[PDB]
């Protein structure tokens, strides 16, 4: 629960130190940006 709750609310940031909150949709944008599909492509399809 703590690993999962930490993840859905703070992304990777609790894995480095204190948790830093981030809006999920945006976070997923950083993810998409990490696999190189530029972050707009998430927000342009967030519902899908």
């Amino acid at each position: 629960s703590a690993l999962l709750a930490g993840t859905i609310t703070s992304g990777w940031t609790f894995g480095a130190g204190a948790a830093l909150q981030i809006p999920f949709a945006m976070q997923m944008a950083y993810r998409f940006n990490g696999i190189g599909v530029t972050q707009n492509v998430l927000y342009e399809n967030q519902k899908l």
């Binding site: 530029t38 707009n40 927000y43 342009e44 967030q46």
Partner: protein, 46 residues
Amino acid sequence: TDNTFVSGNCDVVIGIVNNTVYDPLQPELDSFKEELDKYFKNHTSP
């Protein structure tokens, strides 16, 4: 605009807000407009 890319229009992005985006080309050209218009003015003189 040197920090930012563009894609699509202000209907699709959930939670998008309103804010100016500054373009450093613009006042680099606006100082070129006032440099220009003062040469228009002095050329009317002679």
